[PDB]
Structure formats: C-alpha cells, structure tokens
Amino acid sequence: NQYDVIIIGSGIAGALTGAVLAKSGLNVLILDSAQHPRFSVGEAATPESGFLLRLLSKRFDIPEIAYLSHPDKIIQHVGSSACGIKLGFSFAWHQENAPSSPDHLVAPPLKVPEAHLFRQDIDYFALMIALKHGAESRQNIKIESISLNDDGVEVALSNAAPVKAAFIIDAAAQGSPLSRQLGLRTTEGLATDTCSFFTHMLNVKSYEDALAPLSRTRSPIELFKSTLHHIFEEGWLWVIPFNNHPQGTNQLCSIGFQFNNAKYRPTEAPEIEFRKLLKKYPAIGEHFKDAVNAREWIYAPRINYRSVQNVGDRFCLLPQATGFIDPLFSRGLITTFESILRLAPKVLDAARSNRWQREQFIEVERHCLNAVATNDQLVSCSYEAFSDFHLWNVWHRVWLSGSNLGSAFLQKLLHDLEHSGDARQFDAALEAVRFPGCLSLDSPAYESLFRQSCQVMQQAREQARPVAETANALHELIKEHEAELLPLGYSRISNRFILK
Numbered sequence: 326n327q328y329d330v331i332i333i334g335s336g337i338a339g340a341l342t343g344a345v346l347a348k349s350g351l352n353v354l355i356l357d358s359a360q361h362p363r364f365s366v367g368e369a370a371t372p373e374s375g376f377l378l379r380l381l382s383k384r385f386d387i388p389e390i391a392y393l394s395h396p397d398k399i400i401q402h403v404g405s406s407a408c409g410i411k412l413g414f415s416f417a418w419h420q421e422n423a424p425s426s427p428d429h430l431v432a433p434p435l436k437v438p439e440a441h442l443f444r445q446d447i448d449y450f451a452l453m454i455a456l457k458h459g460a461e462s463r464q465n466i467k468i469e470s471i472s473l474n475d476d477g478v479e480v481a482l483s484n485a486a487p488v489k490a491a492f493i494i495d496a497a498a499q500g501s502p503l504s505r506q507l508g509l510r511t512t513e514g515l516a517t518d519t520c521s522f523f524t525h526m527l528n529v530k531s532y533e534d535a536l537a538p539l540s541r542t543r544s545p546i547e548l549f550k551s552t553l554h555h556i557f558e559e560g561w562l563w564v565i566p567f568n569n570h571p572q573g574t575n576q577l578c579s580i581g582f583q584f585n586n587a588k589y590r591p592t593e594a595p596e597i598e599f600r601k602l603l604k605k606y607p608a609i610g611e612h613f614k615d616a617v618n619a620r621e622w623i624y625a626p627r628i629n630y631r632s633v634q635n636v637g638d639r640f641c642l643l644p645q646a647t648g649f650i651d652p653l654f655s656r657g658l659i660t661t662f663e664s665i666l667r668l669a670p671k672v673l674d675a676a677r678s679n680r681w682q683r684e685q686f687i688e689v690e691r692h693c694l695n696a697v698a699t700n701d702q703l704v705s706c707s708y709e710a711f712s713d714f715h716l717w718n719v720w721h722r723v724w725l726s727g728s729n730l731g732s733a734f735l736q737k738l739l740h741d742l743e744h745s746g747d748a749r750q751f752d753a754a755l756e757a758v759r760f761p762g763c764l765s766l767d768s769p770a771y772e773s774l775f776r777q778s779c780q781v782m783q784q785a786r787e788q789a790r791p792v793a794e795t796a797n798a799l800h801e802l803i804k805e806h807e808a809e810l811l812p813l814g815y816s817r818i819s820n821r822f823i824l825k
C-alpha cells in the first residue's frame with residue numbers, strides 16, 4: 326500500500342491522530358475538502374480534555390500536544406490570539422416574562438485554568454505537529470469514492486490518481502462522510518432534538534459590566550473568564566470570550582444559541598431569531614448593545630445524531646463522525662481525544678502485525694457508542710432541568726460530581742504513566758474501566774446516581790411533574806449517594822459555587 330493510514334479531516338482530531346501515528350512510524354495521508362485557515366466551533370476545553378491531551382502527549386512522546394492543554398502554553402507556543410481563558414463553567418438562569426436575577430446562577434470554579442480554543446489557530450498548529458512528524462496532507466481535495474476491500478482501502482480523488490492504504494479513519498468535524506456511504510448514521514432513539522445558531526462577535530460586553538458585578542454576584546470567578554451558559558426553558562446561549570486573557574490579543578467572542586426543537590422551532594433568518602431571543606430575555610441582550618457580528622451566522626436545524634457501528638476491518642469513525650449531541654458541557658472533545666488515545670495503539674499493533682479485523686477495534690466502538698448514549702442522556706435531562714433555577718441548581722450537581730470523578734480518574738492514569746513510563750499498562754488501565762463512555766469512568770456508586778437522576782428527569786418531562794417535586798427527588802438521590810462522591814458538599818444547595 327502507498328500509505329498505512331488515510332485520515333479524512335485535518336482539524337484537531339484528524340491532525341492529532343495523524344501526528345501520533347506518524348511519530349510511531351506509519352506513513353499517514355491526511356485528506357480534507359476544506360483548507361486552513363478555517364473556522365470551527367467546539368471551543369470550550371474541560372479538565373477532562375486537558376488531561377486527555379496531556380495523556381496523548383505523554384503516551385506518544387510529542388511534547389507540543391501538551392501545549393494545547395493550558396492557555397499560557399497556547400499563548401506562548403501557538404500564538405497570542407489562539408485562546409481565551411476559562412476559570413470554570415457558569416450558568417445563569419432566565420425566564421420569559423420576569424426580570425432576571427443575579428442570584429440565579431451557579432459557577433463551579435476550576436483549580437487550574439483551561440482554554441477557550443480559537444479553533445482556526447489551534448487546528449492549524451495541530452496540523453503543523455502532524456506535518457513535522459512526517460504526515461502528508463492534501464487540502465482542498467474532492468473524494469470521488471471510498472472502497473473497502475479485503476486487502477485495503479482505495480480512495481479515488483478528482484483530477485488526481487487514486488490513493489491506497491491499509492486503514493481509513495474518518496476524523497471529519499462535520500458531515501460524517503464515511504458514515505454516509507456505509508449507512509450507519511441515524512437519529513432514531515435519541516432523546517435530544519436541538520438546533521443551533523452560532524457566530525463570532527466583536528464588542529460583546531462582559532457579564533460583570535453588562536449584568537452584575539462580582540460584588541453583587543459573590544461569584545469566586547469573573548463570569549467573563551468562564552464558559553457562560555445563559556439557560557432558559559426552551560434552550561440556551563453560550564458566551565465564550567477569546568478576549569478575556571491578560572496576554573491575549575484576540576478581540577472576538579463566540580456566541581451560539583440552541584433551541585429544544587420539541588419546545589420551539591425557529592421560523593426566520595438567524596439575525597431575526599437572535600433579536601427575538603434578546604426581546605424574550607432582555608438580561609441576555611445587555612451583552613449585545615454595542616456588539617457586531619464578525620462573520621455570518623451558521624444555522625444547523627438538527628445537530629444530534631448517532632451511529633449503529635463505527636469500526637470495521639479497514640475503518641474507524643472518530644466520535645465527531647460517529648455521533649454528536651449538543652455543545653452543552655463540551656463532551657464532544659472529551660470523547661474525541663479518549664477515542665484517539667484508545668484507537669492509536671490498536672492501529673499500530675494492526676499495522677505491525679498486518680492483521681486487520683473488526684474484533685481488534687471492538688473496545689473503540691464500545692467506548693464511542695456508550696459515550697454518545699451517555700451524552701444524550703446527560704443533555705436531554707439537562708434541557709428539562711432548564712425549566713426552573715432551583716431544579717437546575719440541584720441537577721447540575723449530578724453532572725459536576727460525575728465530571729469531577731472522571732477528571733480525577735484521568736489525572737490518576739496520567740500520574741501512573743508519568744512515574745512508571747509503562748505505555749501498555751496505561752492502555753490496559755484505560756480499557757479495564759467499568760463504565761467506558763460514562764462521566765465517572767469507573768464509579769458504580771456515581772453511575773447509580775446518574776441513571777436514577779436521569780430517570781427522574783425523563784418521568785418529569787413525560788408526566789409534566791411539578792419542578793419542586795422533581796428538585797426534591799434529585800436532592801434525596803444526591804444525599805443517598807453523597808458518601809461515595811468526592812467530599813465537595815454536593816448536597817448543600819445554598820452553596821451555588823462548589824469549590825475544589
């Protein structure tokens with residue numbers, strides 16, 4: 326074969342997959358119909374995504390991958406416009422036909438700052454990592470066909486000779502091109518049904534200046550220096566600044582609003598839907614008095630999908646090509662980076678033994694499809710908890726306790742790897758987790774809390790239960806399971822800023 330591995334898509338997922346494989350001695354070809362620089366959403370890093378990048382870096386000995394996990398390192402090595410800063414997630418709740426209250430907020434702060442990724446700069450830098458380790462890249466191409474054979478894969482291209490490899494990876498951020506032709510993609514059975522409008526803006530006012538200062542909120546973090554979620558019954562809006570870092574030079578702020586299609590369907594053009602949203606929620610409008618759009622609004626009428634399979638003898642779909650639920654909680658990048666970390670060693674074994682059977686990659690599929698299902702439950706139940714602040718306040722502890730447990734588990738895996746230097750042991754440890762794709766990874770007590778909490782929320786939606794009933798039911802579940810969670814005081818509802 327001309328190449329060991331062909332990768333579709335040259336964003337961060339495809340580029341980092343290409344880098345680790347090329348560093349490990351494979352001949353890699355990255356194909357993309359787009360070209361750099363180009364825009365992309367999926368901007369909010371998490372503690373999980375940070376640890377996964379550091380794991381990728383350490384597992385494959387590529388120090389530059391670890392720069393992408395911390396904003397100071399991004400500023401220094403990628404560039405001063407390449408990120409904003411994030412000291413936590415903040416959630417501010419609103420309701421139609423009532424003034425918004427600065428006490429209807431929750432914001433768990435971080436120990437260590439994470440990044441708001443300016444993806445045009447981040448992704449190009451990541452492609453450069455791959456290129457410097459020997460991966461070939463072809464941009465602005467047109468794939469005529471993909472053929473999956475006994476002996477390999479053939480990709481036909483427009484105005485060029487066909488290219489051959491042993492294996493193909495679909496790392497495309499959108500479209501799921503291999504998923505299309507294989508008939509694997511479906512919306513059947515998903516609880517989440519949401520649309521999205523997104524763009525980048527100049528002169529978006531900070532939360533502190535527009536709505537309420539730190540003296541009024543009593544928040545331990547500036548909401549300006551956080552991934553801000555404005556939440557309400559039928560949907561939510563993100564405020565993700567790139568212009569909030571003291572050494573940063575980016576002027577933009579990412580803005581996206583999502584609707585639950587069961588509750589509200591948009592009928593008009595994006596700027597009209599935006600102005601109607603700000604009329605419904607004048608508190609949110611305070612961000613945008615002097616703001617101007619720095620690109621066209623993108624509308625996606627349904628962002629949710631999944632796939633019935635995602636690996637074969639000669640292929641693997643990375644998580645973005647397999648399934649997506651919603652930007653809420655930024656679970657997409659988490660799933661993506663863990664999947665690469667699980668897949669890459671198996672592709673190396675396969676390339677070195679020349680054995681290419683679906684069974685070799687079954688744990689990659691298991692993690693991916695379980696992650697998407699969990700993500701679907703988490704988000705759909707969250708969209709229901711948007712109906713009331715007190716309900717949201719109680720419910721958000723279910724997400725937080727899980728995520729805290731998952732991060733702690735990933736940190737432990739990193740620490741073990743760094744002190745032993747044992748890559749096989751790490752690969753086995755990640756594969757041996759009891760709940761791959763779930764928020765905790767390995768806590769039966771947490772996953773009991775999660776599953777019963779999700780049941781409470783789905784019943785509440787199906788039978789239109791009172792929000793005070795639903796909140797109390799969740800609160801008792803947290804109290805029941807609290808002893809087996811990290812000791813952060815998840816059950817004390819009066820504390821709206823759960824500190825590490």
Ligand SMILES: [Ca+2]
Nearest residue numbers: 328329351352
């Ligand atoms: Ca080779």
